[PDB]
């Protein structure tokens, strides 16, 4: 059989959520994907030689708090925590979604990876230094994206899948 991962991608409406899903998924860049879609997509990939289906939830709507939601985000392996680089309240956003995602976990240690997302647009207000010093202090891998061109998108999921591994059998 298959070797399944649940992953999550959270962040702040806009960051590239949407986009980065798509990117893995379907090897497309989408202009416009509705900002209000949550939904649960599968891709089946090999990672060194394992053949994986991820079980990927791109997070939408209003900010709700519920024990079926958290329960929902409890059941994640890994999360990707993304912001855009041209987008500082996105930045700041992330000890939040960090905060939430260790409060339904009970836990400092959760496989996750920073994703500073928009690496293409010359609007840069987070820098990379900023991004380095907060995944450095939270423990985790920084990787920086282009859902636009694609950089980075298979090394974000990748690294995650491997934090996975890294923290509990697979
Ligand atoms: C996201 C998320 C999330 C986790 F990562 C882990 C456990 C969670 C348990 C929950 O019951 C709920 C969530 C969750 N759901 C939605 C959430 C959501 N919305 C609106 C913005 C876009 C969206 C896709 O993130 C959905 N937004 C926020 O925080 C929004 C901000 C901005 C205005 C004030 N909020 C607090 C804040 C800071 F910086 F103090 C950021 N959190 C969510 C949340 F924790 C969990
Ligand atoms: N230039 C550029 N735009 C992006 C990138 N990722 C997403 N976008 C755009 O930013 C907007 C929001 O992206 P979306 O994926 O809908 O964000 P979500 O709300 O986090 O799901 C859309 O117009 C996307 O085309 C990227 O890496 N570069
Ligand atoms: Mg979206």
Known sequence: ???????????????????????????????????????????????????????????????????????????????????????????????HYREQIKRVKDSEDVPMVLVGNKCDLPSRTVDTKQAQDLARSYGIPFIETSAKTRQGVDDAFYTLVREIRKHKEK
């Open 1 to 95: 059989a298959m070797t399944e991962y649940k992953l999550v991608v959270v962040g702040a409406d806009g960051v590239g959520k949407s986009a980065l899903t798509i990117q893995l998924i379907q090897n497309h860049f989408v202009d416009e994907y509705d900002p209000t879609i949550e939904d649960s997509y599968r891709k089946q990939v090999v990672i060194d030689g394992e053949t994986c289906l991820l079980d990927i939830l791109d997070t939408a709507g209003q900010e709700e708090y519920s024990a079926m939601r958290d329960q929902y985000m409890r059941t994640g392996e890994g999360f990707l925590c993304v912001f855009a680089i041209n987008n500082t309240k996105s930045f700041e956003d992330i000890h």
